[PDB]
Design a protein around this ligand. Structure first.
Ligand SMILES: Nc1cccc(-c2cccnc2)c1
Ligand SMILES: [Cl-]
Ligand SMILES: [Mn+2]
Ligand SMILES: [Zn+2]
Ligand SMILES: [Zn+2]
Length: 454
């Protein structure tokens, strides 16, 4: 009537054998899970990482949050200990419902969440924690440093220890050298009743994996990747303010929106309650949002498999059309892998090779086009040495790497090869093509990959 809960997303209970390799397991479930955008994974009963912290020494700066549907919020960047936050959080829930926190049914919190965000008269504000690990507040998984217990040491090298999964081999984001802290490092999330994460997809349409270490559940809504644009069109119509051009990455606007509203407009939505000890995985370009049932502690990280590579290229194309800033250069990542073809996982090498072939053909065509526009002069340029904000296309903000156009008249400015007309009013013979590699450099790099893939 008031709120109809979306159907449940798939839940997987892998055996220890199925579970041991996270990449093999994700690949196995992908045909099912990519149809629902999110899925939940219950680890084998044996898999039980140790969770030990002193709640009095873990400190973090809280973020404040208003809870009104369709209202704009900014993507995340006063002090609590984990204890005082927990005490504030439990008191809030307990007072809000006049009940002990666990006797409040999840069904009811969900129902109440969607009531209160729609009602303009209710001005509920809540607080939460969000940041990468620091010496003030570290990962909930064991990391090396302090003598570890035997239980802790068992989980140091687990493929599901989220600290590892970036730097594992079947991960592609691994040997990106350009350190992109916000995306190779796990984030830590301290939740309280109703604290929520707005609808979004991950940077570069990557996967994410989310672990609830302890506390009350996290409630999720998820939309399959194939319906991303449907969802966006629904949001444009009902909340156009979110779609105004933003000056940078730290200004992305996001919002709370009832899944029933999406379901009404024929966007498939699924839900789950994630409990302590469970994983949620989000698939490429799968929109998701949710809220916490109460006091809890989660940890999440982006990652990119070989399955993702073509989507990663499509995403950067999509960012260009939108004039959205990139977190990293996709081509730069591809070439870095090519330059390391000998030490690459062989299935990885095979997949990179295919993306690289497309990259080279597109680049060949683009260079021919700008030559026909009268750009004649050229010089090699090591783009990877430039700070990102010193190599963005003036027009579409894409991070340049394969090539760019400069002009002596606008010193320091670049455009990508799609935007040659947008740099300045000088005649194109005054322009230079700056390029990382010649085509003659590129084909041997691709050959090393092919040999490695055999
Ligand atoms: N910025 C921000 C703040 C809090 C949670 C989250 C979140 C949670 C769960 C999945 N994705 C993102 C994101
Ligand atoms: Cl409200
Ligand atoms: Mn997310
Ligand atoms: Zn000029
Ligand atoms: Zn451009």
């Amino acid at each position: 009537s008031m709120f109809l809960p979306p159907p449940e997303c798939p839940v997987f209970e892998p055996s220890w054998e199925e579970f041991a390799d996270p990449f093999a397991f994700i690949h196995k479930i992908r045909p099912i899970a990519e149809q629902t955008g999110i899925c939940k994974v219950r680890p084998p009963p044996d898999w039980q990482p140790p969770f030990a912290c002193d709640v009095d020494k873990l400190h973090f700066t809280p973020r404040i949050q208003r809870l009104n549907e369709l209202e704009a919020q900014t993507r995340v960047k006063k002090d609590y200990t984990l204890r005082t936050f927990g005490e504030m959080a439990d008191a809030f829930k307990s007072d809000y419902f006049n009940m002990p926190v666990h006797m409040v049914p999840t069904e009811l919190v969900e129902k109440e969440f969607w009531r209160l965000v729609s009602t303009i008269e209710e001005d509920v504000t809540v607080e939460y924690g969000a940041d990468i690990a620091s010496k003030e507040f570290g990962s909930g998984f064991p990391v090396r440093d302090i003598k570890l217990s035997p239980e802790e040491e068992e989980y140091l090298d687990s493929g599901w220890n989220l600290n590892n999964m970036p730097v594992m081999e079947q991960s592609v984001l691994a040997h990106i050298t350009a350190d992109i802290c916000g995306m190779k490092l796990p984030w830590l999330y301290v939740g309280m009743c109703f604290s929520s994460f707005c609808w979004h997809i991950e940077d570069h349409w990557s996967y994410s994996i989310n672990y609830l270490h302890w506390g009350e559940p996290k409630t999720w809504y998820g939309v399959p990747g194939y319906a991303a644009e449907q969802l966006e069109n629904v949001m444009k119509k009902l909340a156009p303010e979110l779609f105004v051009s933003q000056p940078d990455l730290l200004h992305q606007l996001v919002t709370i929106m009832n899944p029933n509203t999406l379901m009404t407009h024929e966007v498939p939505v699924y839900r789950t309650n994630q409990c302590a000890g469970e994983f949620v995985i989000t698939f490429p370009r799968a929109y998701h949002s949710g809220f916490n049932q109460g006091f809890n502690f989660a940890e999440a990280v982006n990652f990119c498999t070989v399955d993702w590579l073509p989507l990663g290229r499509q995403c950067v194309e999509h960012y260009r059309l939108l004039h959205r800033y990139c977190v990293f250069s996709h081509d730069e990542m591809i070439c870095k892998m090519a330059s390391k073809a000998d030490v690459l996982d062989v299935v990885v090498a095979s997949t990179v090779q295919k993306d690289m072939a497309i990259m080279i053909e597109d680049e060949k065509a683009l260079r021919e086009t700008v030559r026909k526009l009268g750009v004649i002069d050229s010089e090699r340029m090591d783009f990877e040495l430039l700070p990102d904000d010193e190599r963005q296309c003036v027009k579409c903000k894409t991070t340049c790497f394969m090539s760019a156009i400069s002009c002596s008249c606008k010193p320091g400015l670049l455009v990508c090869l799609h935007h040659v007309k947008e740099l300045c009013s000088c005649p194109p013979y005054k322009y230079k093509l700056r390029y990382r590699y010649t085509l003659d450099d590129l084909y041997p790099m691709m050959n090393a990959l092919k040999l490695r893939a055999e």
